[PDB]
Structure 1
Amino acid sequence: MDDDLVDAEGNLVENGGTYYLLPHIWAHGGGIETAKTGNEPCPLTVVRSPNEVSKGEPIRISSRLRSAFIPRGSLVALGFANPPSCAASPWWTVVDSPQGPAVKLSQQKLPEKDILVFKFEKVSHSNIHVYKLLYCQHDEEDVKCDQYIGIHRDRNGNRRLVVTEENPLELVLLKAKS
């Protein structure tokens, strides 16, 4: 059977490894990067590449647990293998935004529970492993988390990752190499 996270090539995901977050479509954006938006002195904003031919930034996927893999439904922290030189760390986390809850990097050392707020979900496109991206702090087994990360294109064209009730991300995981 299959019940651990699986990459774009059919191999179990290495817990803590770098896998690119790529799209399930073509001419609609590239991999996932950063962007300096508003008044951040550096790209603290996580957005989708405006370059259809890019794999984006190589992201780290950790369960912050002692497993070689990452079980389905488990929470994970996603973070830049080579993050902006101005963040307390490379891990992503959510903060309130007038565009709704935005995914960003922080100039603050964050307590675990602020970064391990992500979870993947099986899109039923069968033959390749496509996942949606959930944001859950308040977690588990009494209530289902249903806060999907969508995209928000601001006036300056940035495809910002926030929590939207529409056009939610659907991704595939490509293992980064040397």
Structure 2
Amino acid sequence: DLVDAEGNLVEQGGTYYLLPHIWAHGGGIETAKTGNEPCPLTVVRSPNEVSKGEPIRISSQFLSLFIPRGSLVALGFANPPSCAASPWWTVVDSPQGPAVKLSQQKLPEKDILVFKFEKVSHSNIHVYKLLYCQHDEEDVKCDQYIGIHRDRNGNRRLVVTEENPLELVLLKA
């Protein structure tokens, strides 16, 4: 089950701050403008440890008051940057591997309903790793994790990683 930082069920379509489990790992999630992006379309972990980052909308593919047990979810900024077609995060291929981004294009649900929270056993509160579920063509398979990769400019980019999956606690905004 998806539970928030205070022990309560996460609400379908509700807004939360995605913060690290370990205080020293940084602040919340936000955006950054990288490469040739017209506006901040790169999803990153804030450069300020005190910041809760951006309020994030969490939604599953089901009509429910709360995020159903073990369901896939879409994640989006409640207040996205101007040049994004929608608030939803999506995973885009690149020379270095899949990266989490916002898009200037309208996205089909199969391109945004690609995340799944996985509870970490060793914890007293509810902490979750973020799984990325790629296309098993007819359906999907959540066999990868989202992590951080600092680029040349220091931006802590959210990307599919082979090690050190990021962990998060969901604080109601």
- Scaled by the length of structure 2, the TM-score of the pair is 0.94
Secondary structure of the structure 1 residue equivalent to 2:94: coil
Q: Evaluate the alpha carbon distance shift between residue 80 and residue 142 of structure 1 in structure 2; reply closer, same or farther with a 3 A threshold.
A: closer
Q: CA shift at 1:137, angstroms?
A: 3.5
Distance 2:137 2:59 in 1: 18
Q: For the Cα contact (< 8 Å) 1:121–1:133, is it kept in 2? A: yes
Q: Which has the higher strand share?
A: 2
2:130 is matched with: 133
Q: Evaluate the alpha carbon distance shift between residue 131 and residue 99 of structure 1 in structure 2; reply closer, same or farther with a 3 A threshold.
A: same
Distance 2:48 2:71 in 1: 31
The alignment-based identity, stated in percent, is 97
RMSD of aligned Cα (Å): 1.9
Q: For the Cα contact (< 8 Å) 1:18–1:60, is it kept in 2? A: yes
Would you say how many aligned residue pairs link Structure 1 and Structure 2? 173
Distance 1:77 1:20 in 2: 15
Q: CA shift at 1:145, angstroms?
A: 2.3
Q: Deviations for 1:13-48, whole angstroms, at most 9, x for unmatched residues?
A: 111100110001122211000000111010000000
Q: For the Cα contact (< 8 Å) 2:26–2:47, is it kept in 1? A: yes
Q: For the Cα contact (< 8 Å) 2:34–2:42, is it kept in 1? A: yes
Q: Deviations for 1:65-95, whole angstroms, at most 9, x for unmatched residues?
A: 1011112321000000001011110000011
Q: CA shift at 1:98, angstroms?
A: 2.5
Distance 1:113 1:143 in 2: 9
Secondary structure of the structure 1 residue equivalent to 2:169: strand
Segments of 4+ moved more than 4 angstroms = 139-144
List alignment gaps of at least 5 residues for structure 2.
none
Q: Evaluate the alpha carbon distance shift between residue 141 and residue 69 of structure 1 in structure 2; reply closer, same or farther with a 3 A threshold.
A: farther
Q: For the Cα contact (< 8 Å) 2:118–2:128, is it kept in 1? A: yes
Distance 2:105 2:138 in 1: 30
Distance 2:111 2:156 in 1: 23
Q: CA shift at 1:126, angstroms?
A: 3.1
Q: For the Cα contact (< 8 Å) 1:17–1:61, is it kept in 2? A: yes
Q: CA shift at 1:127, angstroms?
A: 2.0
1:90 is matched with: 87
Q: CA shift at 1:100, angstroms?
A: 1.3
Q: For the Cα contact (< 8 Å) 1:151–1:160, is it kept in 2? A: yes
Distance 1:138 1:19 in 2: 27
Q: CA shift at 1:144, angstroms?
A: 5.4
Q: Which range moved further: 33-42 or 64-73?
A: 64-73
Q: For the Cα contact (< 8 Å) 1:17–1:60, is it kept in 2? A: yes
